[PDB]
């Protein structure tokens, strides 16, 4: 049950004025595509705070990637769901290396110790299994929504309740303007992640997805089960968990899609005019070195 | 639980092309505004048919308004939710005057006998009470969604599952381009329907609203209870049930808003360029005569 919003003064929506003239703001299945200019955050904050919404944020920091936690968490404190209840879940093989970051009121952090796989591909892929497992261990009783992100990132601007919905994916910053033929889906029919050249809505990034706990558990269980089928068949999808996420979200359409404001790499892509805000961005990195002993 | 969509071939969404350049397609609280060009009905039909969705349609035909049922129901058979399960609920004081309209497979009609109030205003307003009552009598066990419409209308084009959502209102065709000061909300603070001049998102039409059974029961109960408070205080809202609906949807934002394609009067308003389709339209009528003995 939802109580009534209080009286609020804000600009009237303009029925005969598009909120964006340069981008698609709704998918063909009527899911909003979240860009700056599409939402009034004051209305949304009221709606979600009147439900005392709690957001869980999962992040994996395994092996050398513990080095990214301090900036990740500091900047999440500035920009992620401020004003709402937040529960960070840091999955790591090195509990003692988690930095002591000062948290605002109503925000808490749990360290979840997990094993480290040797190959970065397996570390990345086994997040699905690990998130799925903890949906029973903790998440269903502790949070309303889960947001599942890469750690080698920082928040630069607001990431708030405008993202929350039963199931969301994020447009990958390398492909948002691309034709579906150019998307790097898995193209081998032998893999469970296979998507034909004439199928696909978007290329979603594996580095930022989420939803209600129930929908995230479904997604993560399905992707883990598909990756186990592939393993038994001797195939590993071209882009690992991201390939399986794309297969899942083709077949199970998300109820919101986040624009690349929410998943960006300024070193590789700059700051195009179509991005009014750069919210969550890659940290400069030496891929080989940091993924390797 | 939602099964996977089958493989489908359709045009790729265009991230860098607005689906409409002339209208707002999402509200500031991220609810789609449903216009032609915003949705791929093939995707939506798959999603809703994989849930074996049943839609209830309520219509009141009391006193002389029984004359409107034949065209209403015939045209609903052509255009309303075709391919899905439909349950029509005809509320009337004259069961014997309900025309025998031939229904397609999977579609059924129930006649619900109710009393006739003398004043058209009370007939119109007491729909809230009557819909609310039947949410327990029948609707919760029989349908997934309810769509609640005026009878003095006809379907001219597709009205389908693109409208379905937890709670929807429809832009009134006389006000979709108007400033909120010009909206004919109730403006007397003594009424429960009161909305100040600096508040309001849209002017919704009382002639077409709906949602899940749970959300429609909430809306109708709240509006009936507010109309009973007003009656005890000797005030009747300026536009009756429509005034109370607007108060409710200001305080409880709808999860979709239908464009005026879905509620139109061609005699009074013509066929503007902004309407690509005229879906559900007024029948020519003599208001005084037909609302009177
Ligand atoms: O050695 C590794 C490799 C990957 N990851 C986790 O998996 C995510 C995806 O890997 P990458 O593409 O960012 O390297 C990382 O952001 C990080 O959360 C680790 O923690 N340690
Ligand atoms: O005598 C009346 C007056 C109103 N209505 C119902 O209430 C709706 C709203 O009234 P009106 O504004 O269309 O006249 C009508 O479409 C019809 O469904 C009746 O059935 N009989
Ligand atoms: Mn990364
Ligand atoms: Mn009418």
UniProtKB/Swiss-Prot annotation, chains A, B:
Topological domain spans for side Lumenal: 3-293
Reactions mediated catalytically: an alpha-L-fucosyl-(1->2)-beta-D-galactosyl derivative + UDP-N-acetyl-alpha-D-galactosamine = an N-acetyl-alpha-D-galactosaminyl-(1->3)-[alpha-L-fucosyl-(1->2)]-beta-D-galactosyl derivative + UDP + H(+); an alpha-L-fucosyl-(1->2)-beta-D-galactosyl derivative + UDP-alpha-D-galactose = an alpha-D-galactosyl-(1->3)-[alpha-L-fucosyl-(1->2)]-beta-D-galactosyl derivative + UDP + H(+)
The EC number(s) this enzyme carries: 2.4.1.40, 2.4.1.37
Cofactor: Mn(2+)
UniProt cofactor note: Binds 1 Mn(2+) ion per subunit.
Topological type in the membrane: Single-pass type II membrane protein
Catalytic machinery residues: 242
A GO molecular-function annotation: fucosylgalactoside 3-alpha-galactosyltransferase activity
Binding positions for UDP-N-acetyl-alpha-D-galactosamine per the UniProt entry: 60-62, 65, 150-152
Entry comment on modification after translation: The soluble form derives from the membrane form by proteolytic processing.
Residues modified by glycosylation: 52
Pathway: Protein modification; protein glycosylation
Domain notes: The conserved DXD motif is involved in cofactor binding. The manganese ion interacts with the beta-phosphate group of UDP and may also have a role in catalysis.
Family the UniProt entry places it in: Belongs to the glycosyltransferase 6 family.
Entry protein name: Histo-blood group ABO system transferase
Organism: Homo sapiens (Human)
Gene: ABO
């Amino acid at each position: 049950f939802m109580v009534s919003l209080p009286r609020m003064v804000y600009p009237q929506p303009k029925v005969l004025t598009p909120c964006r003239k340069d981008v698609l703001v709704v998918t063909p299945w009527l899911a909003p595509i979240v860009w700056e200019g599409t939402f009034n955050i004051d209305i949304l904050n009221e709606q979600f705070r009147l439900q005392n919404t709690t957001i869980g944020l999962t992040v994996f920091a395994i092996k050398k990637y513990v080095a990214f936690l301090k900036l990740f968490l500091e900047t999440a404190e500035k920009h992620f769901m401020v004003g709402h209840r937040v529960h960070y879940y840091v999955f790591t093989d090195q509990p003692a290396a988690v930095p002591r970051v000062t948290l605002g009121t109503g925000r808490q952090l749990s360290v979840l110790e997990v094993r480290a796989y040797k190959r970065w591909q397996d570390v990345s892929m086994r997040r699905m299994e690990m998130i799925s497992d903890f949906c029973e261990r903790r998440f269903l009783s502790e949070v309303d929504y889960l947001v599942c992100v890469d750690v080698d990132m920082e928040f630069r601007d607001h990431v708030g309740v405008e993202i929350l919905t039963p199931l969301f994916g994020t447009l990958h910053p390398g492909f948002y303007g691309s034709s579906r033929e150019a998307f790097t889906y898995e193209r081998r029919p032998q893999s469970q992640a296979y998507i034909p050249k004439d199928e696909g809505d978007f290329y979603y990034g594996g580095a930022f997805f989420g939803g209600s706990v129930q929908e995230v558990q479904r997604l993560t269980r399905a992707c883990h089960q598909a990756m186990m089928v592939d393993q038994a068949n001797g195939i590993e999808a071209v882009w690992h968990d991201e390939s399986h996420l794309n297969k899942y979200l083709l077949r199970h359409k998300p109820t919101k899609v986040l624009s690349p404001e929410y998943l960006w790499d300024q070193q590789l892509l700059g700051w195009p005019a179509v991005l009014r805000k750069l919210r969550f961005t890659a940290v400069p990195k030496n891929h080989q070195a940091v993924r390797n002993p």
